[PDB]
Design a protein around this ligand. Structure first.
Ligand SMILES: CC(=O)N[C@@H]1[C@@H](O)[C@H](O)[C@@H](CO)O[C@@H]1O
Ligand SMILES: CC(=O)N[C@@H]1[C@@H](O)[C@H](O)[C@@H](CO)O[C@@H]1O
Ligand SMILES: CC(=O)N[C@@H]1[C@@H](O)[C@H](O)[C@@H](CO)O[C@@H]1O
Ligand SMILES: CC(=O)N[C@@H]1[C@@H](O)[C@H](O)[C@@H](CO)O[C@@H]1O
Ligand SMILES: [Ca+2]
Ligand SMILES: [Ca+2]
Ligand SMILES: [Ca+2]
Ligand SMILES: [Ca+2]
Lengths: 388, 388, 388, 388
């Protein structure tokens, strides 16, 4: 009935409590389930939904051959209630796209789907399913975005967009959106920096995003910005590197990418700042997308220690993980005076690791909680290969 | 909460932005999906839905043999949210029909299904699923209609209906409907003209429709009419012929059908007038239903040039297309002071082209947008033949 | 928002217009569809739904073996929007029952499911899914009911129930229900009469039902009653016999069963009185459940002519039909000052006629309409046998 | 619109009327249905839903191998309308859990899912899908709960939780929850007693629960408590033992477990107190989970007779039963001044009894009713083995 207002800080967090798990791939063994990627959650005052990307093909069907390009004309953004299998029967259509972001300003939904050829990609903005605006590739090199929820406060929604090489220097922009309309956008001058698939959240009148450096950083770059779009950037200080691949924990860097031969590629991830502290979610393996854990490093944000203060296990290393992202449940939902931070974890199955003709994901999600919790292993559970 | 009012012009349009794609046929490879035809969109103040026709048979099932007549007692009009597969699980029933039209007057839905034997076809009118009226064949020769959404303004909804030979002179009627009730109807005297499957839209107190000539016109006939039903007809002036089949672009004709050996048959299509200008959506091939593009011809409506001013690619020629139609998103939806023009494209797969025992469609849709866009190819994506 | 009020007569009717067809069996060839029987429609001010009975088994599955008794502990009453396949995905649960009836008093739903052993059957009454009352077998011989919608006026809902031999004299009761509560019930003294599966409707302060005589009547028995339950009975005068089996049209009887060697068994059916006139829906065949037609006999109700005044074809004789019933759309729905009469037709496929291990139904429905219509053939369309 | 208030007694009950049956396993033979356990019902003022536990695997699919632990990271709590098959298409996600409870305080839903490793299990509390609180294992030995609905009155919801050996003495706690928040909790000192899977209900300002003793009681232990959490415990006096396994009916014990060599293990069950009387629902067999019946023992609660006063058959002994539980429909729903007691019955199929690689359940439910009823047999109906 009202919009998400700003000026709120994240809630106190001791440990993470399980919110949802869908077993999408296990169910897909026989049921009708879309081949997914990017199962990211986003909530409005009344609902939480999982958004994802599909090639428009179902599990255990030839059309899941995955010979196809990640960026194809068939890829669309869809959504469904959290916890349920992303089947064609309980999934809503969002937009044609091979890269996107979505979020609620409170009473409605903002979706941004980027589709088209690589040289001239276009983002189609929509407020409640209605095209409200569009942004075209300003650099001509695979324009892309969050693949995680954008953030809204005081009727305004913000996001980050990248265009350029995943090889080196790329170009970035922050957007300010009102009911699907683009009200100003800022160019981000971050020489040396590489921003991709940002996991954002709100923190008192500002918007903080912890992203992915695919150029040469094993540590993650972050950016915080104004409703005017005044910004600040840097990498997460902490030696508890949070990307993948990554070297062993060494002395970190708060303003530059730490390569160490493993800083090259990466994976979408998130982190939650808490003053000088930081919560780092990351894989267990240093080179593969397996296992996942949440690390609380009291200095994370200000220091460069490789020393933390607690680790909660989410998925053990004998199991597969994948994309990770942040989303928040607001005070307008929970009668609270703070924002509840949560995160979803993609659990990739199939190619290139396992021997299948396909590649899909399943998910689990967790939320803040300033009470007791437990670590454990909540893997995908599918038994591959399938009837391949 | 209120009805769609008149006196509004189409919004400014630079290029077309993707709105939805369903991948219905790709999903049908394993999922439960109806064999479709005519996937046309129609919106109410709060929702957009895709209406389509089914023989009541699912893809990859013997009942899809398609040996059956297009006009069978099994054919029904159904609808579903846009973007989702037209499965029996997410499709609503509209009416028994082998030819139809539907549209919203704002707060409700008007559906018209034509069923029965060829000699005595009957249109059953319904407002919100309740039979409100009926019209019977007045010529006794396959009475039929739009196969695209009708148009409503100031509580009144209008449509066009044809009865007679697809071979030559046919007979036409314009209807005026109020809450499913027929308030007057007009006979259209168009000697030399052949109107079929009209793609209509509203334009300030009037209703413009660009239809299909199956007799001998490679160019398309149009008609514009009053709320009193005073009308005007003619063909689209432009040399950029918009039907299929069609000869190469030559000098057009604003008041008569241009045959050139290819003016015979045809395909459902649409066009959007803009003063002396016109937006022409058409196939790429001159003789097959493949490829699709949107052409902006500044004189389209007044001149006969074969010269246009821009072409946006939708589906390339190596891929299949099919029926095309118009639908509009009103100001009561978008806070705008104009109407947003949009269009859907049917992508036929199977017979007679491909080697299958069936024939179905998939869809993609686009909307106006006075911002940046991109052309590309958004084909059906299904890999035929199926388990045939 | 308000209840269905009484004091309304049926609307004028020239012919019958198609309302819905589901193709349930054709879709069941591959999709998930319950094996049905009794697909009867019932509407509330805002919605029309099809109620049916299932053994809890799907088409093309071993559990559809139909070796099972019609009256089994697995049989339940369910419902779904009209026109859609009675799949487990779009069907709502109503009640455990092997015989039932349902109807809306306007704002809510009344369902009556009869289940249990033959000697001690019990009807469980529910208003909006909540058990409101119960009635037990008062004769101890397969207590049963309408298998068609009951009728409600001024908050009160009425139905008919039978207990006793289908072989000869049976015992009957009329009920008066208020919000699921039984407010009085009357015993019907009809010696010589045999009432089963009544197809009722409202007609100005009264409730008229045309039922089925399984004892020895080829013509149909009827009953009309007060809100006090004062009643009158008799058979439909007309020589245009409306049951199945039945002899050729001869001179009818207004107060007794006409046997003629074919008056034995029967099939559920309906008729609509209109003064001295009557609309008779019946099969085409005199001995099998095939073909269906609507006959208008101006004297039907008062005379015994075998002469009618018009016949509209619904399903031709080369095709299968089955149960038939009545339902009405009220003035509170249609802005009309009269009741719109409608009827649904069950189209049985499989055993005992066709060679399958199962037996199911599909449906089509029609409504009043005082405008133009057309007869035709709208059969089930399934191609048996199935993967049997 | 309002909350469930206290101070109400159970309604008068003569016999039990069938409310719902789902045939989930029969439908699962071909349709998409989750492998279930604990299909317990819980209602809010406007709706009744069946909650259940799934391993996230469908019937007739390899992932149903059931080689997996009951407590796995894949197990989740889900819900759906009563009577419908627990398919992925009509089931809502509730929470990640291998043990849970749920209930409505009137306008909303409270769900409690317990997940994680055995040594450190955690209950995640949620009000309307939003994590509101958490409780961790205080004894470190498989913390678990009701597996039946909790009870709410005057905005407060109560439940029982166990932690410790199923072998002997265990430790118990009663909780008081307000909108998902834990407002105080009490330790239950019950030396000699063993409480597990309690079937609770409200009875005038108090909450009565009849549970399961897995240590050495063939009779069932009960507990009643205050909104302050002042409590009283004991076993059900009656000689009509209500657990399984159990010895033949002997003289019972109101304050201690009656072993008799069969008091060891057990099964979830319920009972309804009525003054000195009690309604006992139990299996027919004394050692297997087969058959089910409801027994009315006028002294049940106060005496130790093996003499009852009436028995209603639900499922005969030639058929399988399983978990049993209680749920109530409040006065805020039924215009009544009392609470309507109801109960659901799980009907386990497969392992370890039958020869399949899986184990699932189906359900039937009944409600109070102070009118006529009938006993009978309403088994699961599935024909095993499946395509195994
Ligand atoms: C199960 C199947 O069809 N696998 C095929 C494979 O045989 C072929 O080499 C490849 C490339 O087109 O596409 C799929 O992976
Ligand atoms: C896969 C299949 O059954 N194809 C049949 C074909 O063999 C037969 O000639 C034809 C005409 O009845 O109907 C289908 O096309
Ligand atoms: C396809 C199939 O299983 N048919 C069987 C049949 O073989 C058996 O004689 C009968 C009686 O139990 O049950 C079904 O009709
Ligand atoms: C149908 C099937 O696959 N059954 C297998 C069985 O062969 C194997 O021994 C067991 C243990 O892993 O798992 C299932 O029960
Ligand atoms: Ca990196
Ligand atoms: Ca032509
Ligand atoms: Ca008879
Ligand atoms: Ca025991």
């Amino acid at each position: 009935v009202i919009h998400y207002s700003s000026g709120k800080d994240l809630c106190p967090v001791k440990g993470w409590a399980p919110l949802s798990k869908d077993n999408g791939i296990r169910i897909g063994s026989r049921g009708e389930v879309f081949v997914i990627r990017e199962p990211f959650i986003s909530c409005s005052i009344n609902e939480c939904r999982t958004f994802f990307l599909t090639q428009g093909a179902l599990l255990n069907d030839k059309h899941s051959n995955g010979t196809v390009k990640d960026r194809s004309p068939f890829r669309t953004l869809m959504s469904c209630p959290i916890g349920v299998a992303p089947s064609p029967s309980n999934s809503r259509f969002e937009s044609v796209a091979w890269s996107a972001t979505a979020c609620s300003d409170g009473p409605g939904w903002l979706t941004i789907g980027i589709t088209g050829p690589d040289a001239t990609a276009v983002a189609v903005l929509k407020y409640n399913g209605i095209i409200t605006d569009t942004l075209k590739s300003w650099k001509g090199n695979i324009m892309r975005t969050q693949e995680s929820e954008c953030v809204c406060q005081d009727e305004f929604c913000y996001t980050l967009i990248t265009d350029g090489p995943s090889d080196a220097q790329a170009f970035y922009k922050i957007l300010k959106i009102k009911k699907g309309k683009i009200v100003s956008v800022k160019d981000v001058d971050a020489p040396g920096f590489h921003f991709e698939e940002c996991s954002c959240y709100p923190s008192g009148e500002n918007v903080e995003c912890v992203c992915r450096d695919n150029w040469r950083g094993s540590n993650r770059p972050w950016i915080r910005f104004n409703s005017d779009l005044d910004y600040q950037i840097g990498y997460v200080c902490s030696g508890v590197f949070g990307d993948n691949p990554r070297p062993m924990d060494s002395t970190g860097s708060c303003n530059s990418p730490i390569n160490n031969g493993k800083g090259r590629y990466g994976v979408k991830g998130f982190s939650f700042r808490y003053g000088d502290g930081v919560w780092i979610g990351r894989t267990k393996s240093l080179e593969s997308r397996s296992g996942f854990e949440m690390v609380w490093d009291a200095n994370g944000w200000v220091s460069t220690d490789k020393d933390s203060n607690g680790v909660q296990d989410i998925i053990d290393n004998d199991n597969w993980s994948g994309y990770s992202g942040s989303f928040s449940i607001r005070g307008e939902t929970t009668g609270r005076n703070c924002t509840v931070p949560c995160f979803w974890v993609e659990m990739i199955r199939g190619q290139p690791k396992e021997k299948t003709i396909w590649t899909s994901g399943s998910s689990i999600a967790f939320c803040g909680v300033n009470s007791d919790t437990t670590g454990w292993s909540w893997p995908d559970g599918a038994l591959l290969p399938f009837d391949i």
